[model samples]
Target: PFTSKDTGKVGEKSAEISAKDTLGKAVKLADDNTSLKVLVFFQNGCPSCLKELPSLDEFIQNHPNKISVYAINSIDNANVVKVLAEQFDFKNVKVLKDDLKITNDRYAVFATPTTIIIKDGMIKDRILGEKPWEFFESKLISLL
Candidate 1:
């Protein structure tokens, strides 16, 4: 069970994210025992979103067990999401599909590449637009 909240701004409780991955597994944004959660909202046809994917994958590979990253696509097509994942060769971060835009609306993510960092079930950071792997590393190092 999970509770939904309003905008997931920094220092606020993160909004509930109930979606499914390509594998049909339910996905949620929550903090693990030690690893923090990162919800990256993106969509197809977004250049910046696609550009930062590899960097995100590299971030996950570089920092193992430190964070749980979910690359969420706000498009309403499962097939498109799956194709995007395969085409991009997502090696690390889990990819989820927000077909109904429920999660996006809940989080108030109006940008293509919005990265929300959650720790202890609260929003730690909300980064908008495209950023390099180093940028994310810098933001997460202190939290870890």
Candidate 2:
């Protein structure tokens, strides 16, 4: 968890999908669909993440038919991530736990709670730390 109390924030729209779904399905981003996407760089037990997960969960629920959502578990064995997912009722969210942490390192996400918005397979926006709800709302509208 970090504070947005600084400058020099960089956007990271890149992804690593070397993981799989709970039922053992492959996750890859190499040939991403040209649809809208929201990528959240997160890890379990992260305090800031605990704050945003619920909100993010709601956001997805509200716009289930509109866009695609994905979140990467920052690393392997990241403090009981599978169990944590149930805590937030995020059964529908597609989370690829990076057992190798490949995407985590490539994105250069300096901290937890970092979120990226992708539209038309393009990097649309990025937010660092715990963000204001309105900002996310605005981004959603803009992309829509």
Candidate 3:
């Protein structure tokens, strides 16, 4: 069981997240749609974080309209983040920047490569490390 003092527990409503994307566009995680939202909390220069990109990219590409993926990068060099974003070329995952760690702290993401799955604005699950696309797919199947 994942526990976070600053945010809701699994099965409870999630803490609000308001951040900016790499393009400086405001973004918010809301329950306005039927698609499940996947939030990957990562930091630059983390090997596991970098390694998980391909699986996430594949998952998003395959599902297209079934899911909404957000790659939230913790406070890091802005230029490096932008370069990495372009390098990955993720077609479906929107890259967000947690410049002040506000959103990270709210979610109590103690490590890089943390994945939080949300449905209807509630925290469905919290994965603490990198995982394969199938692992995520299995978790999302029933929820969807």
Candidate 4:
């Protein structure tokens, strides 16, 4: 639940084929023929993440055709993720619960608020820390 300095290996395909959302349904990043997929990893108790998730939701709603956004909660329970998502009103951003933390390990995400950007189903960039929504939006646009 704590942040770390691990930046992770970029330029590689994500190890996970699919992961379950807060509702226990399977979800994949490459389901649609989109240009980019954004995985924003966060912990349940991170103050920065509490602020960032809502902003991400707004960005998703604004750019549905450009990219897909997922807020992967590392080491959090499904019920917890569901509750928090509801509390935060994450209407647009898909919230994922990583109970096993396999996806986090695969991405080397030792931090709570790590952002992984994928292009064509492969990792393109890894951003650590809680950055602004405009930063992510600009980065996704540049990838195209």
Clashes of each: 0, 0, 0, 0
Question: Between prediction 1 and prediction 4, which has the larger lDDT?
Answer: 1
Instruction: For candidate 3, report its TM-score.
Output: 0.83
lDDT of each: 0.76, 0.62, 0.73, 0.71
Model 3, residue 97: C-alpha shift (Å): 0.7
Which residue pairs in candidate 3 have backbone atoms (N, alpha carbon, C) closer than 3 angstroms, thus clashing? none
Q: How far does residue 131 in candidate 3 sit from its true spot (Å)?
A: 2.6
Model 3 over residues 43-143: C-alpha lDDT tens digits? 77665455566676776677666777778887676677788788777776777787578789888888878888888777899988767667877998777
- The Cα RMSD of model 2 versus the native structure comes to 6.5
Q: Pick the candidate with the highest lDDT.
A: 1
Candidate 2 regions exceeding 4 Å error are: 1-16, 29-34, 76-79
In candidate 4, stretches whose alpha carbon ends up further than 4 angstroms from where it belongs are 1-8
Alpha-carbon lDDT of model 1: 0.76
> lDDT at 137 for candidate 1?
73
Candidate 1 least-lDDT 10 residues:
27-36
